[PDB]
């Protein structure tokens, strides 16, 4: 996370971390939505142009971690995937349209002071909150800068509060055809403020606190961007609500 600060303890209890089995390498971020369902971005699991075609047995997840370095027994947990469900109409070919994927844990997880599920939006919360100007939260353990060097990989969770950008400014920043299933966020050149999700932050949760019930909802999923924290460019996130239909059809048929 670029321009992010270290998180407080238990500040994002839904934050899930996608690791590969062999090698033990961090692939992506993700979010906890139920006691056994995890939400990530589809390209984190399937992206052919880079030979990415993961199965259940290829990777694992870690939950409740604060300090990426020292392992914390009891509070954190590791989990195996029973199945992976990628949106059938996820269009990696053109633009990562419908960039989303769900993962079912082999055994459900128990909630604590540090493992707690994020909420998913309704029509009203999504239509009220996802508006240009309002600020949402992004979390991850990604590269602190676009290009790492010798001294880049954070010790604890990193977090930014990034404002939403109008659809026209978004689709003017980049050459990619942005769809109704994605929105973009970030500051602006003449706004004197920076921040962006970066490498390894993909698939993580973009969240906002609802002024109607003081609850945290996941409005987006860290999808893509031109580098990291670039002037005139913005971070693009999967409009979590639009595809929530799909999120039902799987969880309410493979529950």
């Amino acid at each position: 996370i670029v321009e992010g600060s270290d998180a407080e303890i238990g500040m994002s209890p839904w934050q899930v971390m996608l690791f590969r089995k062999s090698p033990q390498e961090l692939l992506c971020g993700a979010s906890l939505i139920s006691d056994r369902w995890v939400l990530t971005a589809a390209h984190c699991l399937l992206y052919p142009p880079w030979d990415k075609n993961f199965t259940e047995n290829d990777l694992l997840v870690r939950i409740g971690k604060h300090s990426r370095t020292r392992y914390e027994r009891n509070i954190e947990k590791i989990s195996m995937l029973e199945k992976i469900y990628i949106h059938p109409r996820y269009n990696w070919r053109e633009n990562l349209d419908r960039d989303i994927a769900l993962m079912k844990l082999k055994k459900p997880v128990a909630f604590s002071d540090y493992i707690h599920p994020v909420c998913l939006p309704d029509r009203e919360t999504a239509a009220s909150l996802l508006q240009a100007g309002y600020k949402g939260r992004v979390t991850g353990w990604g590269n602190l800068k676009e290009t790492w060097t010798a001294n880049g990989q954070p010790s604890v969770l990193q977090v930014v509060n990034l404002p939403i950008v109008e659809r026209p400014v978004c689709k003017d920043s980049t050459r990619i055809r942005i769809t109704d299933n994605m929105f973009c966020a970030g500051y602006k050149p003449d706004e004197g403020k920076r921040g962006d999700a970066c490498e390894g932050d993909s698939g993580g949760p973009f969240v906002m606190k609802s002024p109607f019930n003081n609850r945290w909802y996941q409005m987006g999923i860290v999808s893509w961007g031109e580098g990291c924290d670039r002037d005139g460019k913005y971070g693009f996130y999967t409009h979590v609500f639009r595809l929530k239909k799909w999120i039902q059809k799987v969880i309410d048929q493979f529950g």
Binding site: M11, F111, Y114
Partner: peptide, 30 residues
């Protein structure tokens, strides 16, 4: 499942994180 969004060490213990006032204040103006 019905306690979503409510963090145990914040919203449930009646505490704010160091930056959520930004998100709340972005709803008015500043």
């Amino acid at each position: 499942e019905a306690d979503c969004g409510l963090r145990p060490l914040f919203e449930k213990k009646s505490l704010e994180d160091k930056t959520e006032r930004e998100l709340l204040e972005s709803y008015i103006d500043g």
